[PDB]
Every structure is written in structure tokens, then in C-alpha cells.
């Protein structure tokens, strides 16, 4: 007989039972209680009674306001008293006074006369007193072993909270690119480019690399502010296949592969920036790139595709938004970054940025994986021109088709989705780290 049996008001005293049982098992005092036995049978009370009558050597009793009220605690107490009388032992029962509110009178009449080890001041002092008594009463205990406590704790509290070998499919914010213009052209404009002329403000993207003009557009594609180009000769222009550049096989001393790829990146970014002008999507200036959102009332009830892409938070209106960047390694894609932009009425913008960031964090708190995914996909499909992709305008004949369906990633191990307890608890909380 070595088990240190404990009775408590579960689930009112599960934490204390687990802590004390693990401490006593680690120090060698073998323990028994309702917890640690999740494989409960049809008749658990029979096994509990058998343990108390036969196997238990000491009967600790978690004494709390709800310990005496609970019926199971009282039944276990009565069985303990019966066994104690059968054994004729002075201290076969030990009340652990863990609750301050439990008054002297409120203590159950069956344990009022039994001296109670104190835990109200400190759990450590109570454990010291219990160990001192167990030494005095010569309670058996094996050599100290803290490995068994670890294994039991893992098997009990960490059995339904371990990753599972299950496959999950994730939707990224990287939107593929289907086709590029056939060739990239470097025009020999030389003097035809006006001095101190900002090529950024052009109908089509163009980078004034060296003395040339690099772009996918044809030589005559621009004539409004460049009339002299009507006399340009296509013989001087240099054509580099885009497929060769992307594949990297292209090698020439005029320009290295990396610079060409950076030029293509800038061209794609400018193409997206120009293309979003045609769409009925607003503009918000980020730190370096640009962000695009939807104003109030443009959609029917702000619910494109039955997805709320605009709504109201307190006195302001939040609009979901995106921002586009370009990547070519390891495969050409458009990076999309979700944003939330908060407006006084739904058509203007909030000048301040601190309010923007604070409201962004506050609204992100209330949104989660499904909301972010749905809003991003809805916005991207809104920007679509057909059911397959949307096109950016590089030239009069050349266009870049950017898909509207993000690249699919896959894991190998996953978990199980419990109820939204995190949403229930984390809600309305800020600044606790």
C-alpha cells in the first residue's frame, strides 16, 4: 500500500491535484486520483473504492469551498473514514486546507477534528509539511525520479495537443504570371530623349538604362510627348528574347543577366501601377510601393462575391486593400500584401498614419485566417478582366497576363481545429507583453 490518494472537487480543483500528484510522483510518492486516468471505464467508482480500501496508504483531501459541497468528495471521504476505522490509524486522513474562504464551521463535520496541513500561505510550505509528516508516519517512497513524472505529464496533458501527420493546402499571396512579351527592346534614342525628362510619367513603362531605353513597348508605341521618335530607325534597336533572359542562358557583355532581371522587375511594378489606374480602385501611398483599395458604395452592399470587402468599424469605415510587387526567382509572380485602410466616410482617406496603424491592428485582431484569405481572393478576382487572369499593359500589342488565383502550398503535418476559444479569450486585450 503506497498510493497517496487524493479527493477533490473536479473540475474546481484539477490544477492543484495535477500539481501535487506530479510533485509526489517525481519525489517518489506514488499517487492516485481521478485525473491521470483519462481512460475511464464504465464503472470508475468501483475502481476508486477498491483503490481506497486496498491500495491507498494515505488519504489527502483537497479542502475547498466546493470540495465539501460536491457529493463525490463526500462519498470518497466516507469510504476513507471507513477504511481508517478498519485500520485504526490516527492520521490516515489529512485535510489540505487550500482555500481561504472555507470557514472553520463550514468544514465538513467528518474532518473538523482532523488537523489540516496548510496551503493558504504557500503551496511549497504545505508540501514541506506533507513531506515531513510522510517521513514521520514512515510513508513509503521510491528513490527520487523526475523522468516518470515527465512521461506521465506528457501522456496526460499533452496527448491531444501534439501535431498530427495530416496534409493541409494553403493559399499564398503570390499570384502567378502566365505569359511575357516575346522580346525586350533597348531603343537607341540617344538625343531623342529630352534632357531631364522623367520617363516615369509615360503611357507605358520605360527605364532609361545607360543611354538607351529599355522596355517591352515598340519603338513608335509612344508619340504624344516624343514626336521626333517618328523618325527613329528600328535597325539600331536591340532585341533580347525575354524567355532567354528569364531562363538565364542569355550571356552578353552589353548587360548582365542580373541587371536585365532587375529591369524586368521594375517594368512589372510600373505596369501594375499603371494598370490599377484603369480599374475603379482607389490609391493609397505606402512607404515605397502603392496600395489600392475600394471606396464605399462602389459594390452592391460592399459584398462583392458575397464577401465583405468594405465595412464599418465604430465611427470609421474599413476597406480591404492590396499592394503589388514583382518577383522572378524562383518563378515569376506578383506579391500581394493585404491592408486595411480606414476612412472617415468611405471616399476620403485619414491623413494621420498612427490612427491608420492602430485601427489596422485592431481590425486584424478581429479577423483571422478565413477572413484574410477570403478578402484577398475576392479583391484579386475583382481586379480580374476575365475568368482566368488580368493583363498589364506594356505596349500597344504586348501585355503581361497575371493570374488571379494564388499559388498553392502544401504541408505534410498538421493539427486539429478546436472551438474558437482563442477568439473568446484574446478578444479585447492589448499591451500585455
Amino acid at each position: 500500500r503506497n498510493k497517496i490518494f487524493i479527493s477533490h472537487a473536479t473540475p474546481d480543483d484539477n490544477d492543484f491535484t495535477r500539481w501535487l500528484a506530479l510533485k509526489l510522483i517525481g519525489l517518489g510518492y506514488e499517487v492516485w486520483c481521478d485525473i491521470l486516468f483519462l481512460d475511464k471505464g464504465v464503472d470508475f467508482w468501483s475502481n476508486i473504492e477498491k483503490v481506497i480500501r486496498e491500495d491507498t496508504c494515505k488519504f489527502l483531501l483537497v479542502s475547498s469551498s466546493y470540495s465539501n459541497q460536491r457529493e463525490g468528495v463526500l462519498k470518497e471521504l466516507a469510504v476513507a473514514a471507513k477504511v481508517k476505522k478498519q485500520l485504526k490509524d490516527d492520521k490516515f486522513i489529512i485535510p489540505l486546507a487550500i482555500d481561504e474562504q472555507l470557514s472553520y464551521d463550514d468544514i465538513n463535520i467528518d474532518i473538523v477534528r482532523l488537523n489540516a496541513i496548510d496551503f493558504k500561505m504557500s503551496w511549497a510550505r504545505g508540501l514541506k509539511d506533507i513531506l515531513e509528516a510522510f517521513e514521520k508516519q514512515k510513508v513509503p517512497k521510491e528513490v527520487a525520479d523526475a523522468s516518470k513524472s515527465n512521461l506521465l505529464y506528457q501522456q496526460i496533458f499533452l496527448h491531444d495537443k501534439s501535431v498530427i501527420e495530416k496534409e493541409e493546402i494553403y493559399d499564398s499571396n503570390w499570384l502567378s504570371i502566365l505569359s511575357f512579351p516575346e522580346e525586350l527592346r533597348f531603343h537607341e534614342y540617344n538625343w531623342m530623349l529630352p534632357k531631364r525628362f522623367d520617363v516615369r510619367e509615360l503611357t507605358f513603362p520605360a527605364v532609361r538604362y545607360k543611354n538607351y531605353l529599355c522596355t517591352f513597348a515598340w519603338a513608335y508605341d509612344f508619340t504624344y510627348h516624343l514626336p521626333k521618335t517618328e523618325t527613329y530607325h528600328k535597325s539600331k534597336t536591340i532585341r533580347i528574347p525575354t524567355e532567354e533572359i528569364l531562363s538565364g542562358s542569355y550571356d552578353s557583355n552589353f548587360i548582365r543577366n542580373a541587371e536585365c532581371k532587375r529591369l524586368i522587375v521594375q517594368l512589372l511594378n510600373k505596369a501594375f501601377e499603371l494598370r490599377m489606374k484603369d480599374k475603379e480602385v482607389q490609391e493609397y501611398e505606402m512607404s515605397n510601393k502603392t496600395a489600392y483599395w475600394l471606396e464605399k458604395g462602389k459594390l452592391e452592399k460592399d459584398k462583392f462575391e458575397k464577401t465583405m470587402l468594405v465595412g464599418k468599424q465604430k465611427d470609421k469605415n474599413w476597406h480591404f486593400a492590396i499592394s503589388g510587387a514583382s518577383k522572378l526567382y524562383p518563378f515569376p509572380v506578383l506579391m500581394i500584401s493585404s491592408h486595411i485602410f480606414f476612412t472617415a466616410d468611405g471616399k476620403k482617406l485619414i491623413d494621420s498614419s498612427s490612427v491608420q496603424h492602430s485601427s489596422r491592428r485592431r481590425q486584424g485582431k478581429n479577423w483571422w485566417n478565413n477572413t484574410w484569405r477570403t478578402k484577398l481572393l475576392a479583391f484579386i478576382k475583382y481586379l480580374s478582366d476575365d475568368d482566368t487572369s488580368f493583363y498589364l499593359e506594356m505596349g500597344s500589342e504586348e501585355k503581361v497576363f497575371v493570374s488571379n488565383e494564388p499559388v498553392k502550398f502544401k504541408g505534410n503535418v498538421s493539427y486539429n481545429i478546436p472551438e474558437k476559444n482563442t477568439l473568446e479569450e484574446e478578444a479585447e486585450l492589448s499591451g500585455f507583453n
Binding site: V163, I169, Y170, S172, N173, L429
Partner: protein
């Protein structure tokens, strides 16, 4: 298909050779790795601050419960976890009257106010360590929650005060009254400003494991580690007061498996590049820093590192590495790793509401990868980061190393935050305290300090 890889939880060694992932489960269940026996306090603050500290110590002695004990477990009580006596009986309390703080707090500009008030709270501690024969393990600075409120962000009182103590090597822990007596401070309504009620027990955990650590404590240590893994963390801070835009300060946090890192303050010089805003080191100071770290490691361990991973938030140029590869023993493998934070690769999930797991990683190539240090962890049944997790881009910029090994090391280095007893963190410890250590270094520029552990930095 852009397949991902899962890298298991690093697992952390505790007392009696017990390996548990959560910081505050194998701590309570077993106890600290090193069993230091006395945390005699030296609280410094107002009398009301002393009362708050005494009441909070009495609370800590008794169990404190969390509303959600599945995610934030409880605190069984200090002596029931750390098996050492930290009570209000032994305290070398040193008083500062309210008017004393007031006269040093009303100095117009935050500049003079902060300097004078930090000197006020520093002279007392220096005198206590000098002229008293009762050497207290840790000095607790219970600052009333008006210095933190009135004297808001050199800035960052918390940082300047800790920085002007490296020469004296006084292990100190700084607390705010609102952090301790959060119920007492309340807004216009009856609801306290900082509602810790659902995480009250959590507040008891971090406040304890930190205080134990600064009192010569080693709460935990990495379990699986290689024989010589010296991790260098190159912090960086532009000196805004310097007339030269190139001028900047740097250091190097050296980490073994022990999780207690040594800070090697560097030399202030032209390390900034305004054209592209990239920290870079010239051959002379690069060699100086590497030699300092190498000699310190040899002295502490008796032999030179077998491997040396220098983590940084930017890319090392060729001058830096060609200097590093010179002052380094042939029998050594030097690697340089760039750890960018944003690098947009958000991975939303089609299934439901909860976020992606924590061990998932996307390996771009043999020299680049993405790691999800934040998100949802089954053990906590909660998302470490709200919203959708942001990945972490890791590239082996210089040197030859296995990308999977670097990813595993970077994930393991997230479990070494003694200051906050949490399951894990979103950054490796080498660069986690980069801004904090940078501000500390900027505060302490003229004075040159030797290699010192974190107990005087964080």
C-alpha cells in the same frame, strides 16, 4: 507543388536532465537547471513601491491562476517551482521619497529629466553596492508608473538606466508599479487600465523567471546541441547625434547552447551606407570584433569554436568576409546568415479559421528558405501571433552550410528568452534583442566595457 517541410520543436533541457518544450511547464514540474538558493532582494523605489513589491511577493508565494490555463498555465508558487526562498523578510530596500523623484522629474525637456532621474536611481544603487556589506543577488527598481507615463520616449529610460551600469556589473531588474499592482491603477471607469485578470498567473511567471535569471539563475538550456556552435549576433545602430552620417555603432552577441550570451561592444566608426542603408564593417574593426569573440570563446571553453554562424539582418559585402576569413583558425567553419523578417510569403489556409502551424518551412533553394517561427502551436491551442503568421526569410549569404541545419538552429534559438517565460518567440535570440542592445550601446558610447553577459543588458 510548393511543398513545405516541418522541423520539430527544439525541446529544452531542465533540471534533472528533463526535456520539455514549454518554458513554464518543465520549470514548474521540475525546476530550474541551476538551483541557486537565495534571491535576496534589493528593491529600490518609493515606500508605496516597496508595499506593492511585498504584496506581489506574498501573492507569488500563493498560487495564481489563469482564466485560460490550457494556453497560459498557472504559477504554483515561487518556492514550489524554483525551490528557493524569495520572500519579503529578506530585502535591502532603499528608499526614494516622492518629492525626490518629483524634483528630478520636472526638468522641462525629456533630455535633462531622463538624465537626472537615471542618475538619481543609479547613485543609490552604486552606493548600495559599494558601501554595504550585504551583497543582494538582484537589485529591483520599482519605478512608480509616472516616470514611464510622464517621461515617455537619448530616450527609453529603461535602456539608458541599464546601459549606465555595465562598468559596475550590477545585476538589476526593472519593474513598473502598474505591472505589479495592475488592479490599483484604473481609468475613469472601475475597470483597470491593464486587464491582466485573464492572464494574471502569466504575469507571475515572467516576473519570476526573469528575476531568478538575474540572480545567477539558469532557468533552462537547449537539449540537442552540437559541440561548439558559437552564434554571433551583429547588432547595429546609427549614431543619430553624430555629425557624420557614416558613423555607427555595433556589437556581437556570442551565444553557446547555454542561452546566456556575451556582448562584445564594437568600435564606433563608418559602418552606415546612406546610399543603400546597409550596415557594413571595414577590415580593421571586423578583424577586431572577430578576434575579440574568438579569444573570449577560447578563454571560456579552452578551445576555438568548431563552427561560427554570424547572423545579421542585412548582407555582408566582400571586404567584411575577406577580413573575417583572415583572423580565424584554419580548423573552423565560418558562415554568414541573413535573417529578413517581412519577405511577403503569407500562407493562408483554405480549411478553416485557425492559422498555419509553427514548424512549417519553405526551402527556396540550397541557400534560401522560409521559416514560420510564429502562428498556431497545438500545445498552446492558440496562435502565437494574431492575424496570419508572417514568415521569416533565411539565406546563407557567405560560407557553406546546410540550410536545414541553419533553420533548425534558428528555430532552437527562439527558446532562450529568459526575460519572458513564454512558449517560444518569433525571432532567434541572437537578433531578438537587437534594438534593445543597440539602444543600450548608443547610451553607453564613450565608456568601453569588456565582454559582459546579458544579466547587465536585458
Amino acid at each position: 507543388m510548393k511543398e513545405l517541410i516541418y522541423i520539430e520543436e527544439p525541446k529544452i533541457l531542465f533540471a534533472h536532465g528533463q526535456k520539455c518544450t514549454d518554458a513554464r511547464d518543465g520549470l514548474a514540474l521540475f525546476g530550474p537547471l541551476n538551483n541557486l538558493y537565495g534571491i535576496k532582494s534589493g528593491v529600490i523605489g518609493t515606500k508605496q513601491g516597496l508595499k506593492i513589491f511585498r504584496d506581489y511577493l506574498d501573492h507569488i508565494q500563493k498560487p495564481i491562476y489563469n482564466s485560460n490555463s490550457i494556453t497560459r498555465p498557472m504559477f504554483p508558487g515561487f518556492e514550489a517551482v524554483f525551490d528557493c526562498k524569495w520572500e519579503s523578510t529578506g530585502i535591502t530596500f532603499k528608499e526614494v521619497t516622492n518629492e525626490d523623484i518629483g524634483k528630478f522629474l520636472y526638468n522641462s525637456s525629456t533630455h535633462k529629466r531622463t538624465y537626472d532621474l537615471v542618475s538619481l536611481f543609479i547613485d543609490k544603487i552604486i552606493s548600495a553596492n559599494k558601501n554595504e556589506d550585504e551583497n543582494v543577488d538582484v537589485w529591483f527598481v520599482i519605478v512608480p508608473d509616472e516616470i514611464y507615463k510622464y517621461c515617455r520616449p537619448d530616450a527609453q529610460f529603461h535602456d539608458q538606466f541599464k546601459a549606465r551600469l555595465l562598468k559596475h556589473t550590477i545585476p538589476t531588474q526593472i519593474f513598473r508599479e502598474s505591472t505589479l499592482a495592475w488592479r490599483d491603477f484604473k481609468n475613469a471607469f472601475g475597470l483597470p487600465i491593464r486587464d491582466f485578470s485573464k492572464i494574471e498567473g502569466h504575469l507571475a511567471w515572467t516576473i519570476s523567471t526573469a528575476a531568478f535569471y538575474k540572480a545567477g539563475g539558469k532557468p533552462w538550456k537547449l537539449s540537442d546541441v552540437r559541440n561548439g556552435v558559437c552564434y554571433l549576433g551583429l547588432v547595429y545602430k546609427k549614431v543619430e547625434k553624430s555629425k557624420n552620417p557614416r558613423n555607427a555603432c555595433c556589437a556581437a552577441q556570442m551565444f553557446l547552447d547555454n542561452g546566456d550570451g556575451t556582448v562584445f561592444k564594437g568600435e564606433v566608426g563608418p559602418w552606415y551606407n546612406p546610399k543603400n542603408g546597409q550596415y557594413h564593417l571595414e577590415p580593421k574593426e571586423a578583424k577586431a570584433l572577430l578576434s575579440q569573440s574568438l579569444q573570449s570563446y577560447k578563454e571560456q571553453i579552452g578551445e576555438y569554436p568548431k563552427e561560427v554562424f554570424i547572423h545579421a539582418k542585412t548582407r555582408f559585402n566582400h571586404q567584411e568576409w575577406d577580413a573575417f576569413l583572415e583572423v580565424t583558425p584554419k580548423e573552423t567553419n565560418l558562415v554568414g546568415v541573413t535573417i529578413s523578417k517581412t519577405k511577403p510569403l503569407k500562407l493562408y489556409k483554405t480549411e478553416g479559421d485557425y492559422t498555419i502551424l509553427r514548424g512549417n518551412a519553405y526551402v527556396v533553394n540550397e541557400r534560401s528558405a522560409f521559416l514560420w517561427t510564429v502562428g498556431y502551436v497545438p500545445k498552446i491551442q492558440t496562435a502565437l501571433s494574431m492575424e496570419v503568421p508572417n514568415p521569416l526569410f533565411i539565406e546563407i549569404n557567405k560560407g557553406e552550410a546546410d540550410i536545414k541545419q541553419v533553420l533548425k538552429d534558428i528555430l532552437s534559438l527562439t527558446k532562450l528568452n529568459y526575460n519572458a517565460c513564454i512558449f517560444a518567440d518569433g525571432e532567434p535570440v541572437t537578433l531578438r534583442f537587437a534594438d534593445k542592445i543597440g539602444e543600450i550601446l548608443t547610451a553607453s558610447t564613450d565608456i568601453k566595457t569588456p565582454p559582459l553577459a546579458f544579466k547587465y543588458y536585458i
